[PDB]
Amino acid sequence: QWAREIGAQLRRMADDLNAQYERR
Amino acid sequence: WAREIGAQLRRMADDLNAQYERR
Amino acid sequence: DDIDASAVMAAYLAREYAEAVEEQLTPRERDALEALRVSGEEVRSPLLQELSNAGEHNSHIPAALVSALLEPTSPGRMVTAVELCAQMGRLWTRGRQLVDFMRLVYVLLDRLPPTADEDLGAWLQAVARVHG
Amino acid sequence: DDIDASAVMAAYLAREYAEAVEEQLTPRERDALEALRVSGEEVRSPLLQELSNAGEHRANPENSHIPAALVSALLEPTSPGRMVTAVELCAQMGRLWTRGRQLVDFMRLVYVLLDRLPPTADEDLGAWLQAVARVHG
């Protein structure tokens, strides 16, 4: 299931993106 | 009233269509 | 104070989709788009006049007027119908009005005659020659 | 030669509609838009890497089941980062769905985004995109 896979990497890149600006 | 506008919209379009079919 | 996040996402997606389809148009398709932009503005003037005289509130009326213009139709009728959707869009900026704009567009593109590609090709090339 | 009438009309309306909302956007809404464009572009690179690394059938799906599943899963306790990633995914699918019945597939994926948005979206995204604005000026 690439559904589980791709999503896991999207949630990962989205979390990283979120943390780049949560403090700024 | 809707086809009053409806009739007018067809009026515009054919005026519009007339200008550029000649060219 | 507080932003309508839906409207902001809409504005963004609309522009990105426009630039996408425009970058993938053919040279003459791009010449047709400019041709449709001028003719659309040429009829937007009296098209606005008729709707101001309506003084009316739903997406039911717009859907019928478009399909009415497309029942034996001509390039002029197809342009007037196109510009009508654009004006409904300029009214339907926020909220569930955006979904209304998409359905009206769907109606437009769904009911176009099968010869529209060459009917508009010839007619919109005539508009371009006369406007440069 | 002949043209794709539906493809051209699509360009005209989408651009005319794009100008419509932006005009009616409030100033603070317009700052938010310029911050979404920036963060949307930043996540775009890693986003287009995972899609392509999955394949051409995944980078360009013939359907809407796959992208709409990712969007709905990103927006399931959400944060501004997931919302932006989801917005940009919808845009990328749009950049691919540019002619004919691909336009209606695009309609479905926008609806999933706007309908699955959280109640706190207006509030959180307002704050989070202010950080973006002042980090970039």
Numbering used by the authors:
A (entry chain U): 132 to 155
B (entry chain C): 133 to 155
C (entry chain B): 5 to 61, 67 to 80, 82 to 142
D (entry chain A): 5 to 80, 82 to 142
Anything the authors wrote about it?
Orf virus, a member of the parapoxviridae, encodes for the Bcl-2 homolog ORFV125, a potent inhibitor of Bcl-2-mediated apoptosis in the host.
The four canonical BH3 motif defining residues from Puma, I137, L141 and M144 and L148, engage four hydrophobic pockets of the canonical ORFV125 ligand binding groove. The hallmark of pro-survival Bcl-2 interactions with BH3 motifs is the presence of an ionic interaction between pro-survival Bcl-2 proteins and pro-apoptotic BH3 motif ligands between a conserved arginine in the BH1 motif and aspartate of the BH3-motif. An additional ionic interaction was observed between E80ORFV125 and R142Puma, and this interaction is supplemented by hydrogen bonds between E54ORFV125 and Q140Puma as well as between G86ORFV125 and N149Puma. A comparison of ORFV125:Puma BH3 complex with TANV16L: Puma BH3 reveals that the mode of interaction is nearly identical, despite the ORFV125:Puma interaction being approximately four-fold lower in affinity. However, in ORFV:Puma BH3 a fifth hydrophobic pocket is used by residue Y152PUMA, a feature that has been previously observed for Bax complexes of Mcl-1, Bcl-xL and Bcl-2, where Bax M74 is lodged in a comparable pocket. In contrast to Q140PUMA, R142PUMA formed an additional ionic interaction with E80ORFV125 that is not seen in TANV16L:Puma BH3 complex.
